[PDB]
Amino acid sequence: MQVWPPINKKKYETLSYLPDLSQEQLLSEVEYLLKNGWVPCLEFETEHGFVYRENNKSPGYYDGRYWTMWKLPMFGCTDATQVLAEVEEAKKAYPQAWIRIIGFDNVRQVQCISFIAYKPEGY
Amino acid sequence: MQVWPPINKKKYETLSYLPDLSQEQLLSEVEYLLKNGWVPCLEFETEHGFVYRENNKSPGYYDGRYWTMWKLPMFGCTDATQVLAEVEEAKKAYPQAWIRIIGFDNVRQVQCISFIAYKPEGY
Amino acid sequence: LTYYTPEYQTKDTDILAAFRVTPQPGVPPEEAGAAVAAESSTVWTDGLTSLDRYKGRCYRIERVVGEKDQYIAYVAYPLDLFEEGSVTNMFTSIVGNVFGFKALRALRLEDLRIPPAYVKTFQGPPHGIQVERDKLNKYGRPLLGCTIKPKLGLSAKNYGRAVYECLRGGLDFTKDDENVNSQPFMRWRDRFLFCAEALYKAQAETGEIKGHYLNATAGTCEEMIKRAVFARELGVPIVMHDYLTGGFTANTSLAHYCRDNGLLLHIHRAMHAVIDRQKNHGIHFRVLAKALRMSGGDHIHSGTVVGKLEGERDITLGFVDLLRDDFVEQDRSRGIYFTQDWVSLPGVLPVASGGIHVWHMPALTEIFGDDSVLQFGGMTLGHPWGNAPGAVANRVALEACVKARNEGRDLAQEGNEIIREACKWSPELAAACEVWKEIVF
Amino acid sequence: LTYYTPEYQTKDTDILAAFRVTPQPGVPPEEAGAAVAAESSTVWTDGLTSLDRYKGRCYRIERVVGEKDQYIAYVAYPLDLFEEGSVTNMFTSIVGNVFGFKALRALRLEDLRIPPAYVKTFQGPPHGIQVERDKLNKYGRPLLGCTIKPKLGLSAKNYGRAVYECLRGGLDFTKDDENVNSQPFMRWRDRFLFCAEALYKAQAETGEIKGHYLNATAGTCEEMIKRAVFARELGVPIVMHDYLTGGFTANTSLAHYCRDNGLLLHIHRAMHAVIDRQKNHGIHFRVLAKALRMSGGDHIHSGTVVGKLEGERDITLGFVDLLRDDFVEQDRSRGIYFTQDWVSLPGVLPVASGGIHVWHMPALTEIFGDDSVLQFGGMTLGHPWGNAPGAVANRVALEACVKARNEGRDLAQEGNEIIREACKWSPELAAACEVWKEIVF
């Protein structure tokens, strides 16, 4: 019988309960986005890695949902590698940042995918 | 004439004004629960050892009342020693945690007992 | 005497009353009992309805053993006579007129059986025992309250200072005097504010939830609600009301308010001795206590057992059970005339106060057990080292007792010893025990 | 016994109390009186203020003539102890705790001197005697009320039918039983509506203003206000409240409501006998009556004098004066322990009820005079010809008495004769008088 730790198990939504994605796993995910025709986009954050409620506490209001856009959504990119590259670019630049990859389905105007691509030391 | 210190006298409810329970005192308490047929259960916390009010301040609302469950309530346990064991288990694992033993009276569906079994260094 | 009906088979929905009657010389019991019932419930208009449907009826007499001129007359009242959710109306109907019946020397209501079909029309306590321990996160020991003295003349800021000192020492609650409402020396809003400042500070310091019973008793319902409203704005846990002086109508309004806003309600029994002291005339405190549990309150001052004969301690315990438990089986030894089923209406925590000292801790624990609040005045405030130390003294005394009990010690046989050992390691306790140590040791 | 201060010079702003004390064997009077005062008003916090400023003090003892173990202890309480406009608080402070003091066998509060500086903090009666006669346009004779019986079980529509029959016969008011609030057999809104229909019809028929005391007594303040609100919407003149069962906090709220909306308030004294019957213990009805005049009510049930010894009739008249007049000089013969100045707070109309018959009319008129309401149950409802005729009977009986009195006749010497002559020309009256005529004539 094991005890799930109440500390140090911070999560990041989809796929964050699985073992860290490997370069190939990452790539596979990027390709899926591509197969379905979603537009990949990187987002990063250095201060508030998690949701909080500073400005307001009414229903549905949370701070920290939005992260910073890394460059622009990657319209027309066709090579899941371009994407991985950017990730690489982003971590060199902000080794302390949390980096996630997101995908837009503009036909429905929704974010259809969002997973963590890199976490800073200790996360 | 002595002055009760306004600092460093943090408490933990029942029995926290007595000298720290000894292994035997602890055991005696566990046995009482057992004699009355309450179900022992451990709970621990590593961050907020005390009640606070972050999310809300309406009457009766406090944060920090709930702690994490250590394993499951110990249904049918018959040996106060099993319980002490778990405590031991819990401190090795979270030496920084506050650990308390609680007892359920399900006939009345109440917590009929709750005392601190171990405090981290400096408490 | 169409009102004396020994053949009568009480119904599950009947309200039953046990009246202690002292008839006027000459008048037979049966006539006695039939008169209690007759204008305790009930021409041509008479034929427009059915007497038999709304009449109280004395279905039973009993001679009080020992005494002369006393019986226990048992009266049954139909459910329909009563306005749902109204203790005011139960009281008007049962005790409104008969106490002045010529033919009775004296009358005393001793008990009432509130049927489940009437109990279900009341909200009862805003929270009740279980909910309160859970909201306060306090389990395994009686709760401790401190009484702020003097009763009148303290300023709002000095009130809060004594409140903070007393709480930071280990007590769970502080209490406004039943008399402190709003006065020239201390207006209520000022008291509420300062007490709130003081209880938060004591909470932050000790790490334990604190409460101060803020008295909302007032001249009018509007003013009483206005006071509970500010306690709600301040985010504090408990308010207080003098249910007999304020009255059942107001109390029921405040208990609803408390339920709707999450506030615990501490009830003070001021004025009760005016009605419940005399053994031949009045209303026994157990009836006043059932009425409070019905109207609503989370706590109720029940007296002390300290220096009470066993027969008395027993009557007390009978009404404690009636306050806290779900079902109480009839038991005349303890003054329980009817089996009372509360059909899950929350229980009320008995509040013990009046001359309690730390060396009384073992017995109190013993008698009341964990579900009670022990209140101290002179024990805290009166300690040689001030309120905080005074507070430690009681809190360690209480904890020593619980631990002992938990270890299998006999509190009744070893009280003095347990206290005495604790004094060995609690200076605070030691200071509180010196005059007692000299007399017993 | 820093609480017994015979040197003390009461202040104009003091609240004074006269307690009838029956000390425990052994304890001296002075100690008695000092204990009444000591925890009837009042450590280190003690030095944060001045005891002397907020202490009750027994400045006088008196041995009760005749009796054994009884004194009259006179206590003075500072104005500052009391919350302005709060009868609840006056009561909590004075009678909250002492009735249970170990050292007293029994205690009875007999009187209170309410200083003008405290009286001025109360609204008092919504209207009072003078305003009510003027609003009703009734001058020169006691007012007549009819009691609707049975007490419970009548339907809303039958209630109103009896109300209309009784009013159209010459009575000014009809009264809801103190127990009728809202029940399965008759919900309040239905009663209010039907009674309103019935009183307007009786008003239109006779040409005289009518009223029905609509009971607003309820479980909660909100519900009580909701009932008075509908009476206001219906445009009727008077509502009713059971001040002791509802409680002072609610009553004060309803009396304010009445003032603000023009409604007269009829007060019923249900439950009083529980507290004011026993001569050694409790609160004398005169104290309950001053409290009502302070909290507010335009009418108050005061009992009957019918078959009361003169010493009793006297005590009654003492509290009648206290209810109606502006200034009442101290008078122990009548049970007036303090001179009471009401500084123009309106007077309350005493309501006499309980076994009144037309042949009692002469005496009632005589004893109470014009400023009273005489209430009849069995006299109206119980008349051989029904409510209306029953009503005529009382109204002519009353009018015969007033005329006689006005002509210089002695009601005390000629009562029977006056009644008897009226019977000659009032069949209705004749029918009501037959059993009496046989016994006396």
Next chain:
Amino acid sequence: LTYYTPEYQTKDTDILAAFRVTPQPGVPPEEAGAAVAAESSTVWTDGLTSLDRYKGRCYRIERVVGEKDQYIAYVAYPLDLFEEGSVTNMFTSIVGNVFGFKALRALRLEDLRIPPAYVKTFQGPPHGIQVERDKLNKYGRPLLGCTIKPKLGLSAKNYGRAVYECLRGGLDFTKDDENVNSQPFMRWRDRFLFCAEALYKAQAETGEIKGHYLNATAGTCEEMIKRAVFARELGVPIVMHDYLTGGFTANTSLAHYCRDNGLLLHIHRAMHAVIDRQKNHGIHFRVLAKALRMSGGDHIHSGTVVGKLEGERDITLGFVDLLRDDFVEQDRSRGIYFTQDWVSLPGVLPVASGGIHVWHMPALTEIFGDDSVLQFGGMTLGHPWGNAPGAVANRVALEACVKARNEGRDLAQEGNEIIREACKWSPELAAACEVWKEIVF
């Protein structure tokens, strides 16, 4: 049979209904279908208007293949018959009377075509799928809910403890039982408060937004709104309602309330089986689902596909599409009788529950895809290691499935394998899989 109009050309604004009719032996179909329409919509007053304008009309019959006595009668109702924004009124008009028509053995409503001109009179879901993922910041996978068991008898504080344990493990939502409203064992305000404490703690711990469906279902609209008001004060994300037992009128009020205050609304379908189970009589769940999307709810319990034959899985998927999509083309294979255009009314997330186990994860993912909530009772609570681990188990199982799918694996072919590999690195998952591993491996 001026009601059977095969020539009829439905209008774009018509409401069309597909009724499954089982006529009484003897009565022809055409007569059948004309009777459904005749008193499903419709003397001299008749000539004061135009029948033809407000009549339902059966413009088409169809013999049900396989069965005996069954047709599919297609009825058209004019837009004007319906009160804008009222599902209550759509239901009264269509299903109010015909189910009791003598001449029918049984009748079942299978589908309704809600025209765009009527859809636009409804608010629809307070938020809908897209808005909810964005408010919760959850994309790319079905949402996970935990069911707190037992269904009744848990205390408010134990409720929250199980809520916190279940959420901190990886589940997005916890759910109040549809039966938990406010009861003696757990009053609603206490539950709301404790659950709020528990969901914030689990949110703070994991870094992921959490929600607890707080049930606001109540006896009256006022009480239901009063409960959502406190959820709003607490700042929580979602409330819950039992739309069929509460009723459409209340649900529409709560859905508006939610829109106006930012709360997501989770709908429970309690009682549906009373109406939608029997294949010959009632209202098919797809009609109950369109009505919910119209009245409003952000989530709706739709059953489980676990162990359902493909023909059933298909009918289910048909109503899932109707709940989530903007336009659904007619498809009898899936039980879609009319093409339904939702003109941008938000979509509702289907909630799958009932006996789901981790080894069912692959199929559920597969069948429902990302826009669904999977709810587990026994899977969480029933895990050998408690709620948290139970929660991890499901969350890793779900994540394994999504990843697999994302990698191009066939969930239908490799379900067991994917699960099984995950067990290799999730103890928690491993513990949940042991009885299954033995049977399949």
Next chain:
Amino acid sequence: LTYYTPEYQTKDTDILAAFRVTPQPGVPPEEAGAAVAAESSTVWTDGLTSLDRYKGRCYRIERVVGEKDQYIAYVAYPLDLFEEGSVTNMFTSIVGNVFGFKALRALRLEDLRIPPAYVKTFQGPPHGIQVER
């Protein structure tokens, strides 16, 4: 089938239900009746309370005369299960889920005994017959 309790003595405060049950071929009545009661009312949380206090219980079965596959199963529900003054809640609790129980071919609720202790929590008719006339 700790839910079939023919020994059970209904209480004055119980809510009783008479269900007309048409079991699936194979399943005995007693099992039938125990299933109506089991998820018509009711793990570790289970031990945090008392099952026995909040369980519906089938204290009686009866074969419908004439018919095949039909019984009248009598279920007792504790007063505490119900929110005072809420017909919505009485309905959710009794008829909320069982009509869809796999094991039943069909179920029909025929009657309910509303105890006086629950009736008193309702206002009932705004006026009623007598007042209206």
